[PDB]
């Protein structure tokens, strides 16, 4: 739950700060967060949906790290990062719709979907980012 907010915070900032022509020192600490997302998420596999007419999708993460060697970001560096952000932002939509749709009566404050129960391990806790909302 705390790591589901931390996935969405640094995908929002990745579409805002990684723009064409910007200086590298503006994004020098976001890329260290975004590379450290990817290392934690590789090799895992997930499954969302199944209730109602919500379709079943399978998720699989095998991506490469971002480069940390430019002075000003160019259009190669932006377009190779947009096709990684667009796969994560599709994953977070289907986890959030899987959780808003389920409910329990004994302890409703616990996660109910299969994907959000799996994200609550100590393996995934290093993705944690600031909690400012």
């Amino acid at each position: 739950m705390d790591v589901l907010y931390s996935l969405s915070k640094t995908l929002k900032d990745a579409r805002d700060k990684i723009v064409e022509g910007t200086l590298y020192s503006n994004v020098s600490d976001l890329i260290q967060q975004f590379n450290q997302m990817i290392i934690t998420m590789n090799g895992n596999e997930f499954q969302t949906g199944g209730i109602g007419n919500l379709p079943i999708r399978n998720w699989n993460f095998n991506f490469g790290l971002l480069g940390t060697t430019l002075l000003n970001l160019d259009a190669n560096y932006v377009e190779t990062a947009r096709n990684t952000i667009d796969y994560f932002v599709d994953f977070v939509d289907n986890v959030c719709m899987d959780e808003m749709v389920r409910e329990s009566q004994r302890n409703g404050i616990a996660p109910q979907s299969d994907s959000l129960r799996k994200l609550s391990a100590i393996k995934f806790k290093r993705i944690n980012f600031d909690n400012s909302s």
């Binding site: 590298y24 020098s28 260290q32 590379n35 790290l65 940390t68 060697t69 430019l70 002075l71």
Partner: protein
Amino acid sequence: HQKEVQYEILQKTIPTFEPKESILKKLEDIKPEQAKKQTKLFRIFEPKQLPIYRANGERELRNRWYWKLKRDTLPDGDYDVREYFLNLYDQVLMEMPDYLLLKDMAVENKNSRDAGKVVDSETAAICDAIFQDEETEGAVRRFIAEMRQRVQADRNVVNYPSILHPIDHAFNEYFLQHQLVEPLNNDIIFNYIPERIRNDVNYILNMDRNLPSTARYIRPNLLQDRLNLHDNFESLWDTITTSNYILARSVVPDLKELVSTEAQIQKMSQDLQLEALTIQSETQFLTGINSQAANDCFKTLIAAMLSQRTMSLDFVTTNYMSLISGMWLLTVIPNDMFIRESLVACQLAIINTIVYPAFGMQRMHYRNGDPQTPFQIAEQQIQNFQVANWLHFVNYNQFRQVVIDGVLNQVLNDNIRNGHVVNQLMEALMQLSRQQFPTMPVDYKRSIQRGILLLSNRLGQLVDLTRLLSYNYETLMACITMNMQHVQTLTTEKLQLTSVTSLCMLIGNATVIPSPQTLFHYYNVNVNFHSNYNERINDAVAIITAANRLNLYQKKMKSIVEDFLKRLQIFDVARVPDDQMYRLRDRLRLLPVEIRRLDIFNLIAMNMEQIERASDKIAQGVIIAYRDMQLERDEMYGYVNIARNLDGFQQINLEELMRSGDYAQITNMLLNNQPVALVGALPFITDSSVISLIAKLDATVFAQIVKLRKVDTLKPILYKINSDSNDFYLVANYDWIPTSTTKVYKQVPQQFDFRASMHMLTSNLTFTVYSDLLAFVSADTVEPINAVAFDNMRIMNEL
């Protein structure tokens, strides 16, 4: 003799030095860094007089002060120019100071009305020439006889005036504000010794020296890993653990007051008879040495566990006395420390001829593959309480992974930290010393049942031996700084079980503990290597990051990594394989830069353009418009064809033209007279002649490009005509407007402003920097007969 050939192929890919015991000098020569202190102010520019000319005229009777780059060693070509700023970048890295004291530099002002001073020797030579010449204004000449220092003896803050360029002040204010030096007291030294020694009763420590407010030090970097060396650098982690092995071997204490071996071999040779059936009959006994096996096993077991270097077992499976004493080796020391293929071969040899025979069971076959060790199979196979209590400890006997203070270390149970597990090894070994051993010949049966009572009758001396072994391992691991990462080492330090039988049958009741002069020395050479390891990473990730932002694509970063591993001083760098040489490279360029080494690269990269354009060797481009544009006026050069921007012309990079090789446009734009601006960093030619201007010289030096197909010989002319260096009368006497075809793109300098180039620098009065913090610590030790372990109960209860 293939065995020495196949081992040598594996050895050539490992950077361990070949005399193995020469590594100990290389670890004890790593010194902590000396605190630097400079004596000059880091000046790049200097003010120099320079003649000026009138509009359409000659030299007047005065001069001006300009800012000139001293020592112009700027090369040509855009690749070589910004490669010169990488050697300048490293020239700021190796000579930045750790601290500054401005009173040691101050020079007396000779023009001052009262006793006034300036900050060093050159700012007194500059301000004296301002005082003399007839051009400076009254408010400046009156001022430099009245500017004052402020000493302020208490609080240790001084102020001295200085005359610096705005670039040169930027490097000097960064050195004053950001310096590594911080105050010392008795509290920081007390929080510097490790935690077990802070809370031990065997060691007595206090402070016997005052430390003033003047005392200082610097904090050596003590950060962890950053780049993992323990997962994929298999050939590179081997030579790390063999360097901690040789260090920890020379720190453990010697044994004291052993059993006399002449009366010990005598009891052993008659308790088991040596005429029964055996073929050795004297090759059984090699345990007669005490200071060379029992000493050299006690050093082997502790130093291999402090360095996390794996061990392998050497034995002869017909010798069972060497095999009974291996039952004590496995019940005390965890089975992670051994090679799996050598662990099983020693476990199966205990069981084949001892464990199963002890109960008449059939000997087992292992089919070398399972996750289950032979102790693990022989455990649910035997329904005896006394033995299976022991077989259950020995296989789930392993380390425990948990941190203290930021350091992950490997520790063991309670029952090995006292000698309580040996009270089960007694019972289990004693239990089978009455097993009637069915099908066994009674000759060989009585020799092996009495050889076990050589060991089971020594209960009180082995309970205290594993009580001492655990304490010396516990005390010496307080002085570990890196993590105790556990992984199977490629090569292996070898153990002989003859040395274990020599340790078991010869120990006395004498307690040895590490003295604090040995505990402190072992702590210093762990911090000195660990701080060296972090300062070299932060030097290597800075040059890789600098030469990438600076666009040096021919840099070949393998030479940075080869210079990286030389300065750790434990590597034969010519033996490291090529995949780990490249995997180490792409882990360096995914690390952030230290902010001290990053605040200076920004400080140089924002000033590259200004240093380059005050150079007096290079001009950074030409234009060619094939029309008679007129000749500009200048108070620096007289008449000059100087350009100040590149508007309306095609900029054509000379470097990208050089690298591509295909010209195809420079040929066309030159044959058919097209206007063009060649952006580069060429060197130029000055010219003071009106006859050489009329003769159309400047448009005749570009046909070299199309024939030679090279750019490196490009060299245009700068017309500097005036009324004193040549025969000027063609300009002054006739009516003609001076025109030319080409311009040489170049910047004019800036002149000396006094109000914009005088500052007031602030530092400390005096202090002292102390390295080697542990010299302020008095260290004593309780008498070794009264020494106790963690439970406040005395070790060596055998007396």
